[PDB]
């Protein structure tokens, strides 16, 4: 239940409140059919695409139910937090004609109220890296959706008292947007203190209490504490209530939020700078599915080890050439991962892929293909940064590995175009002197002749008809694997933001990001592992 | 604009031309006729945006109304002398000289109807004699498959092919043997009256305004008579004891939207004053080139009243005649159910879903059908679609003066409770004691201190929220201008754009402002009493018990916790401010209850449902801690009110003028002399 992804959404929990038996009389002692409903785990409705497309998928599901109703969206609160990439919002509808199924003898056996909707969380560009030094503070909100029991106290008191508008909480899933005791302008905020010294994330999850006359300062009650353990882009961990609840409010809040979520809180930093935050969880009795999201204080003070891209230095990337040519970045799971696999791909139809030798699984690159605007040929570079603990910059490295060239529409070449998938590199750790051979026709001299790829600070230009340029990146154990792209393909190139004369950084439909150069026509992506 | 008209009698389409002709010789609007053979083509054309208006009788208005055309009348014609005008024509049954037959023995006799599905030829007569045809008709429609009853029969417009009888006596002499045309010698009241003057048959089924409209020799009356309902047959002109259906009158129609009540009513009023009864020889709009009658308009009729912007077909056609136009084309073991299903009408979603839960447990004996605001829940309980609801006194007025009755009334627990009373059914009602509560934090305010301040009351048009206070404030001021009174105010149910719905908040997202359903946070008793305590207005006018049930967290939610009853005190008429616990002394006034309004149809039946599925199944006495809970429950003041500790025994005050008390009717007649209401004026049209 912690296989993370780009966007989740739980659907409201409509409880079967039809007394009379299926074919009989009124399930014998006065009850309903389904007198409780906890959640399940075939319901996290993974999403994909643009945030608008995710929202529209939810919208279209509710529409598929019924088409006249109107959807009460979330926007009218979330502006209060000025989110930009990640949102933890809600959709619902209370214009629904309730489901009735009757028996021949007039009796009834199924009744589901019309209230239909989801709670959801959606993130963009998972954080391939994170701030490193010091601690950071995010602010942001959350949303939740509970189970749907029938007597949460044993007295059937009005479902207006304990929190929510009528019929929520007692005959459908108690939810959040339908909670109406808080500082009514701002119900559910929360704060996030992240410390990378221990690669940990603590957070407070707060439900504003109620002010009688709408003047006073708030009465924040923190409802859920968050202790999460980092793992690159993602983080696992535990959501659990504090004890103030269990002590004071054993009748109003200790009655939905009453079981921890052990190892069952997942989340991911979003924004390539680790500046926004998404997450979800489900309390271990499957009774409170809740999704949350926060955002930086906008006063971003940089980190000294610059891991998180977006005004710092990249660490790990997933680079994909777009449709039939140009290159782009596809948001990064942070995960490493294929020869003649003739099976389906997530792109829609049957991937017939050919990616060879797998004696190096840390960095990946090469060919993705898929047969039944269009999508003809696929070059990818999915490379994870080095674990900065294994082997420092004192030593010597001899890299052999994978290689793939492309040119565009004309007939292209493969890994064995060098007479062998070599992509050979020699470097000394203590000097950072990357050089080697990435053959174009045969050998080193009948290829692009640029060498001495020194690394200054973090930045680098490893290179292996004058004044050329090639870029790379670290993978595997600490400085133990290498690889990147030639920065000389066309006017534009492969790899980092395209060198297309630096006019506008994709501020239009032209793509004129970065510096100029001359126009050959040849591209290549390379990578390699260490040997000794 | 060019206003058209849709003829049906195109040979007699001369009371069409003459109109635009001798109106163009005056000035002329660009009128024209767009002729067809049958009226249904005209209903199509107007729905198809091809014509503006053609008058229809009863059955034809019904057929012209339902989907997918949705036609709406605008102008209800007037019948009678220019001194005493009415719009309720009658339908009667004329006979031979002696005849010796009564309406209950018409087996094989030779009839003369007036037109397929008309309320003096087909619908009223059939329905009158329907217990005699005995047709198990899911197949075999009425037309003759069971009008074998009569052997000989003439009914113009009938499908000649299908059945043999329905135009034998219709001497049409050719393909027009059966036609719905202007050349059927036995078509209108005059034709289906010559079908009795010629003695070819006996029973003519026609209006009451013909026996004197075509018998000029005032000696030939004493033989022709009127076939009465009451087992007998009385002389002609006593028809107010011998008529058969108080039908409505042919009422010019026009589209649902863009139907232009205004435009055609304008030109029609010009013509009503210019060419009306007893006027110039320039083609009066009531007359006939002799030989025919009612030529594609009406004749022997003075004028036509204007039908208000509220009336649409179901409302226009009455209730009796509408139930009768429907419950003939559905089987007798189906439309005897509808007379046992108490279709209840809620208001807005939340009590609709309370009502659905009810329907479920009901044993299929109480369904539900809802609406948006008590105005429209009335607009349903009228046209047949829901035979009950419950509403606060000022609404018993606005409804009873639309032609309904109060059935039972929410017998609130008056201050003298003192016990749980089991005979709560037959303890006659006591009204409620409406007060004006205020927060004694501010101590400056007195009785004279109500005008121009910030204040919010409980409802619009109800007795304790908008008509007992503002009535007395009008009686002192004289300026029945209602927004100038108070600077800012939250009265739920008014316009939302004024300076009178500025201090309301609405719903969660904050969109439903002042809407009179349960989605306007400051609506209803506890609603106004929220608006005050949250300190945005000063004086509240609400029922007393609410300031009693909103301390000690009696609403255990946010706003009603933390509050004390020693924090507010009442107003008076002098200026003092006493403590609330004894509002029996210094309140604002008395007022009448709410009550369950319904129709005269199904009122011995809503004493067999509500009387024993509330007294049982019903909050104190058989179940509901678990199943029904139809009162103060999981839900608060929905579909009833949460002091409804029983249901009543109204004890005679059916004629609301006997119920509301002669003083409050006086008050609200003084009030609604400055303020109209969307309903009341249309429904005062519907008693003319
Ligand atoms: Fe008529």
Residue numbers in the entry:
A (entry chain A): 42 to 365, 375 to 387, 400 to 434, 524 to 615, 637 to 704
B (entry chain B): 5 to 692
From the paper:
Crystallization with NgLbpB was unsuccessful, therefore, we used cryoEM to determine the structure of NgLbpB in complex with Lf to 3.65 Å resolution. (E) Final 3D reconstruction map upon non-uniform refinement was obtained at 3.65 Å. An alignment of the Nm and NgLbpB complexes with Lf had an overall RMSD of 3.7 Å, however, an improved RMSD of 1.4 Å when aligning just along the interacting domains (C-lobe of Lf and N-lobe of LbpB), indicating a conserved binding interface between Nm and Ng. Additionally, the N-lobe of Lf in the NgLbpB–Lf cryoEM structure is positioned ~12° relatively to the NmLbpB–Lf crystal structure. Whether this structural difference in the N-lobe of Lf is just an artifact of crystal packing or if it is truly important for function in LbpB remains to be determined. (D) A zoomed view of the binding interface shows extensive interactions along an elongated surface covering both the C1 and C2 domains of Lf (buried surface area 1604 Å2).
Lactoferrin-binding protein B (LbpB) is a lipoprotein present on the surface of Neisseria that has been postulated to serve dual functions during pathogenesis in both iron acquisition from lactoferrin (Lf), and in providing protection against the cationic antimicrobial peptide lactoferricin (Lfcn). Here, we present the structures of LbpB from N. meningitidis and N. gonorrhoeae in complex with human holo-Lf, forming a 1:1 complex and confirmed by size-exclusion chromatography small-angle X-ray scattering. LbpB consists of N- and C-lobes with the N-lobe interacting extensively with the C-lobe of Lf. Our studies provide the molecular details for how LbpB serves to capture and preserve Lf in an iron-bound state for delivery to the membrane transporter LbpA for iron piracy, and as an antimicrobial peptide sink to evade host immune defenses.
